[model samples]
Target chain A: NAMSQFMNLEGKVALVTGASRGIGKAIAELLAERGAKVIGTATSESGAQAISDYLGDNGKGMALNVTNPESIEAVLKAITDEFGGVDILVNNAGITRRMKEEEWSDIMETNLTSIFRLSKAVLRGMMKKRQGRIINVASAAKAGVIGFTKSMAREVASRGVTVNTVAPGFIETDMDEQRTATLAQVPAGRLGDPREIASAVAFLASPEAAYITGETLHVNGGMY
Target chain B: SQFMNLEGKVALVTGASRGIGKAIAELLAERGAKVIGTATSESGAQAISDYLGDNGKGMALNVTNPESIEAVLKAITDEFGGVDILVNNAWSDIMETNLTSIFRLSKAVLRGMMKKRQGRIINVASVVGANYAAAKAGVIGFTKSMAREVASRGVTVNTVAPGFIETDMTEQRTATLAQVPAGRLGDPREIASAVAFLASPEAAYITGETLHVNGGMY
Candidate 1:
């Protein structure tokens, strides 16, 4: 009871990107259950509608494309118009062009630049409030194949607000279905459940996480 | 074995008032070690003591102050019989010209371990402190130096750099896990376990190293 009580998320507002399905959706649901008013973003109106349906009256959904700054701006404006301002911002929308090391720009735009845009947008609001939470959904890619995650972490952390990344190893998401089917090797012998990652996300979103900033959390069940 | 057994051993954790530090203090005490947790406030110290029951106690020590650190270590030495396990889990927000105080804090905390012939110093380091820019790169440099400084003395100093751990620290990052490879965040217990292993005797040779317990991406 004490543990459960300490993990409460009673009065917070969390905005998650790419929350139509997979880990993003899972995190959104968990946050809402713990008492945070959640707004999850997806690329389609249908997806947004689905999120609203799942989260019911309290939660809202946004349609935006992570690859475009205009898309991010429009969504932020809409969400702000509704909720006043977001207390938690989750930049979870990321994509990979899947190339043979030749398409650096694609990787940079999807994996790296998207975070820059999203965090850059809501950072001033967070800092001015001095009481906001920012969780940048990053991959193990930011760290490198083995032990390199510091580069991307440094780029956006100086804003008085915290900026950390998570590098998940072998999650069971549609995006990684192909890799898990043949190429990926996990030490845990099974794929990581979306709820497992969401559980972690919920903890970070709590008030108890103030001292933590500019960190990356890994949840691959020891896959790395 | 004697290495991992803490039945009669002594462990000292800094910033053990709440959250991850509090969890760590409870875990180590539950494992049977004579645990002593530090807090900056008397009330916080009392809270730790109350949670720890009998064998687990708490003290007041400002991790950022060298004088306070020396006094606390001296008290622990007198009470817990030469510290065998030292958990440098303390940190501060005094960001001065690139985390100057963070480095200073690290140095002050390591003094106790250096004097001892054999000790396990597990610093609760993060992936952010391991990088460059507005980040606290000084933490990494300090951890590396401290690890090397104590490696030959039968004292192992290592940093368990947690990536996106599911503590309150990553609220922003947790929301952003959409782009993450595993599409998830990390667990605090997972991080605690890693620290436990590094602080164990089995990891005697694993000095000057950092074990990243993040998902597969980084």
Candidate 2:
């Protein structure tokens, strides 16, 4: 029952942010494809609509401003009140460009702080039920994610909740010049596929990954 | 394609006649690998061979012993050319078997793996091992150091430390289940599945890491 059901996410409600395109879209689609009842989010309503188009009957898409605490609150309330609480929380939404928001706390708010607020909101239900997976995916430009993820993991580990980070290296979506230069170093001899990163995320998100927390799973194709 | 597929790969798991090691061997075989399970005695090896059917072969190899280590591996190399994945799951002694064997076995297999540039080494740390103390701690340190050395070579080394499970030593009386957050002891299959993931091709990027399948116990 374990191996056959290892990466199977059937009946799991997954919350994935920044799901409009690229790595986030790939992550969202793969989780939904693997049988999670996914709720994908985007920066704009149109972006959310495109995600909704793919999610169809199995999932929903919403506009979530990850920088805004009010946005996080409203989305969690909707997901909990109507579609059941999040069983898996994926902190995939991230920001690289520095900018103010509808109500922003700058880059830290989006990259570092957003994870705490989001994880804390979903963690209550997960703690009560004694099961959950929180996987963060994005650029590794920031430092605090591992610290936050590891500390949060230990804090909630005894409650049956796991917190982990999946860091992606050079991907197919990177600048061409960087890809040309980066290929010389990557032992994989090529840029990573988005699905490759998704595959790692799916593994960590699975119930089988329960024993593993406070860890960083690098999907860098051994480029490090 | 499905992610966890293990086609055309040969895997060797030690002390695999029963319990957790047996389950790991079974799961590895089921995923399409040519599995070779090792046991302490002939009869136990036959039992392993019988369950594996055509997918694998079972041999009498006392992996916990230093002498037995080199002899059994030669037999495997003679039969299968070389192993692609190795699971260090045997435990016969406190220091020698549980700890040193990993060092010995990993070194033994590295050349073949490095030449072809694809390999996996999964060490099962006993908690029922931190009960392993210096032993299991060494397992973690060894894993990290070895992983860094071999990462560029495409061979990964990792560890799995299991908390309490169904198999037991029967020494206790008071307070066992209360310590675990999942409210029960883990099934060996649960740990096996965790091992199965780390052994997969998709998990190639994960090295020098200890996967704790303790059901949320410390």
Candidate 3:
């Protein structure tokens, strides 16, 4: 009986961005399994359709270009219309090598700014309800991720909205051939599974994690 | 799948008579660990036994005493096999109570743990504006250094730094309470929950990390 209440999400509604594949897909699926009505987002309509097919009765999928404010507003509005408001928000969409490599703004827009926009969009409804969980997949070494999380967390903590970060290291994802060489050095002696990152996100999203705010949980297999 | 399940594990929590330590012991037990709660006084130990019941046992342990450490470790070894998780939690003369006791207890268990190539050491560290903060910082340093050393053997070490807990602060200390972004002081269970996560199987990859349950105060 005591175990049932610790990390149970039963009636909660969760929104996970970039859930078409990789880490995002794992997070969306785990939250759904935890009993949250999960609405997964992707950059393409086709990806959204696939997510919708995968989620089935658990939840649905929607299109969201996190970098665009309009897309964020649209997807959020649709989610609100369907489920009243978000109980958990997982910012999992991000880009690292899709640009000229010198374009730092692309990384910022997709990773940092998208989190700010989406989190603020979901804030008021969460504040009014007096309970919310926001878990960001921010990989910034320091300023970009940690600073933003702490600042937002401070302002919203009194409102019962807890914000935090999950940093995954050397995950065996879609395309990481180079990670093969780095795997042996990991003290854990293995690459992180997508579900491992999802495990961290699910725990942070649970009510048990309410006291944790403006903090980072590193799942890097002792490499960091 | 079940998450944060600590079934079949053995946990030893110091100063488990009340407050955060009490909550940690309760949670670890609730999660299915054979927990052992230690206090300096027999009364405190009895209180822990009364609450824990079948989930765990209680013992008297003055963490500052070397003999006390040896006795508890031997008892734990004889009874529940050995310590799989060690929560170095207690408070007193500040420095010696916080840092030295942790180092001693951790070292006492390190042999069995490292031998098995698996164990967990989670320090319940605190922070103040200055000296206390400095000592807490030292605990973090110790945690990381040890974490790195034993991580290769599957042993993990980490710290949980709580901010403005309900039991520790009262109405008189509300002056700084407003500064806490959470608007209210943290509950003992909240801190306990963080420790539970770190001690769980799902968090095996995590080491040399500090999970701060401070409600964004920093």
Candidate 4:
């Protein structure tokens, strides 16, 4: 009953975003594979189809434009209609773009604000249950991610709904070659695999991580 | 995986005759950890022993006195080998009992834990007061620094800052209820649950952290 039951996610309902590929896909698959009825999201139909294909029987996929308010509401309604309510949420949908004024707002909308909105939408069900997990996959370089995570963590901590951020370092994704110059800084001396980040996300999503609220678990291979 | 069990561990909880300390001691033992609770008087110690029979024993420990600390450590080491968990909850004299004694007792247990390469140290600090506030703040700082130094060595140091838990002392303090966000005084068992979580194997990756179980009292 020690370590074996610590990571059990059976009967849990988990929702993940940007799950068509890369880190998001890994997180969605891992949570579903671990027994959570996972609902993963993408911006397009084909991407959503890919998620449905990979998660057959375990869960399904839906198209979600995180920046659109209606899309967020629609996805939540659909999940509720099908699987009761979300017990765990993984905010992994994000973008890395140039710092133009409009681009900054777009990035903020998808990376941070969407998390705030989605997290609020699910809070009603979670607070009623008095137990939930909100795990946000935030980039450490994103200026306000950690600050927002800490503040939100404190707000929902008393309700037994833990909100935490998994700050992934340079992982082997589309952003891999983009960060080659900084590879030497990582103590592990290589790009982190997506599964490594998935491992951290899985742990934070479990009942074992109850006491670990309001904190950022860095999965950067010591690249701080 | 045995999320709340503590079958093979040995725990030493100070000031464990009543209130929050008593709750922590009993809960730890109930979860399967061999608990050695401490009190400042013979009768108090006897009460702890009677309550914790079979799981472990209790002894008198004057936290403010170095000799008393040494004697208790010796008795525990002889009986239980090395301490796997150390819960420091003594709150008396602000300087000695609250602050300095933590430093003394933690240092006393470090060698044993470090040698074994695994340990948990949970300290209970206060939230409101004058001198008490300063000492508790000091306790937080000490916990963080010590946590960093021994983090890679498999030892974790954490603090639990309770807001307004019900007890003999807090029975008269209910007039302050409107201030708490939960609109009620916290039960001692609530604090005990948080302590037990930190002392378990699930909290190995969590260190240098202060868990506030104040029911949203800020």
Best by TM-score: 3
TM-score of chain A of each: 0.80, 0.91, 0.91, 0.92
Worst ten-residue run, lDDT, model 4 chain B? Answer: B90-99
Docking class of 4: incorrect
Decide which is better by lDDT, 1 or 4: 4
Best by lDDT: 3
Q: Kindly indicate the candidate among 1 and 3 with the higher TM-score.
A: 3
For model 2, residues B82-196, the per-residue Cα lDDT tens digits are 8889998853357654677788888988989999999999998774523466677878888878887887788988888887777744235237766765556777887788788
How well does model 3 score by local distance difference test?
A: 0.86
- What's the C-alpha lDDT at position A209 in model 4? 61
lDDT of each: 0.64, 0.80, 0.86, 0.80
Model 3, span B99-217: residue lDDT tens: 88899999999999999988999998863226767777889999999997888888899999988787853345677677788877788898999899889888888899988887787
What TM-score goes with each of the models? 0.52, 0.84, 0.92, 0.73
Per-residue lDDT for A105 in model 4? 80
Question: In model 4, what lDDT does residue B15 have?
Answer: 88
- Give the top-scoring candidate (DockQ): 3
* Candidate 4 collision pairs: A1-B1, A1-B2, A2-B1, A2-B2, A5-B1, A6-B1
* Stretches of candidate 1 exceeding 4 Å from the true structure: A1-5, A96-108, A140-160, A174-184, B1-218
Model 3 residue pairs with clashes: none
A183: Cα error in model 4, Å:
13
List the lowest-lDDT window of 10 residues for candidate 1 chain B. Answer: B127-136
- What is the CA-based DockQ of model 1? 0.04
User: Looking at model 2, how many pairs of residues clash?
Assistant: 3
